[PDB]
């Protein structure tokens, strides 16, 4: 009942240096789910299902 | 009953430095999903399901 | 009852530098869905499902 | 005589990012030389003496 | 007689990505010399002394 | 009598990538020399004495 955060730090990303040097990137997807490259993220949920970088699967029923 | 909040920090990015030199980028989706190129996001949700990067699928019912 | 925020900082980006030297870019999307190039994107949602760079499915019913 | 120069490059600088948080700078110089700070240049010379940050002396005779 | 340059490069910097996070610099010189914080520095001398961060000193005759 | 050169690299500096965190940096020169955080420098000498971070010292005659 007294609570108390102080400099405190969540899902946090800070002092990030990237070199990506790269003479060719190819994704070649034929009907398929693909994710790539995510560099420097940060999420916080409440009370939810949180996902960064998810391949998720053709829910069938 | 009493909350203090000071200095927190959530779902923060900063201090990102970044340098990509590529010849060629190519994304060929035929049909499907596809995320690419994330950088520095930040997110911060509350009673919700968060993604990022999400490659999801297609529902059929 | 005394809720005190102060300094506080939530789905934040900053201090980003980002050089993109790239001789070609190219997405070739046939029918389907994509999401490229995301960069220094903050949000912040209450009771709600916050995405950031999806790449949802067709929904077929 | 017959000389071919072709996409040389020579004192060349290129694709640089840089961040620089400092919360304080300072310099206090009393009766002295002092160079701070260079970044990112390019010089060239012929026939002469080419200095990029130089702390010269006190040339007395 | 036939010299031939092609694609050289000489005196080059490139793909530097730099993070400096400091809470205080401070340079107090008391009648000295001081060089201090180079980054990312080309040069390209002919017929020449070339100096890129020197500390020289109090030449006296 | 026929140089050939071709895709030559000479004093070059890439690809670097650097992060320093520092909660303090401090010079306290008193009559002398210094020098101090050189980082990517890159130089090419003809005919020429070539220094990069020298502390000279003080010429008396
Ligand atoms: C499950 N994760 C979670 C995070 C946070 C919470 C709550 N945060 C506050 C803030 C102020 C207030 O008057 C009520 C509440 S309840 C509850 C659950
Ligand atoms: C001692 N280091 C050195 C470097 C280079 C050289 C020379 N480069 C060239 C280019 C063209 C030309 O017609 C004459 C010359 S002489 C000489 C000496």
């Given at each position: 009942?007294?609570?108390?955060?102080?400099?405190?730090?969540?899902?946090?990303?800070h002092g990030?240096?990237?070199?990506?040097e790269?003479?060719?990137?190819?994704?070649?997807?034929?009907?398929?789910?693909?994710?790539?490259?995510v560099?420097?993220?940060?999420?916080k949920?409440?009370?939810?299902?949180?996902?960064?970088?998810?391949?998720?699967?053709?829910?069938?029923?």
């Open positions: 009942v007294l609570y108390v955060g102080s400099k405190t730090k969540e899902g946090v990303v990030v240096a990237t070199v990506a790269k003479t060719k990137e190819q994704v070649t997807n034929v009907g398929g789910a693909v994710v790539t490259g560099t420097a993220v940060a999420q949920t409440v009370e939810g299902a949180g996902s960064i970088a998810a391949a998720t699967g053709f829910v069938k029923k």
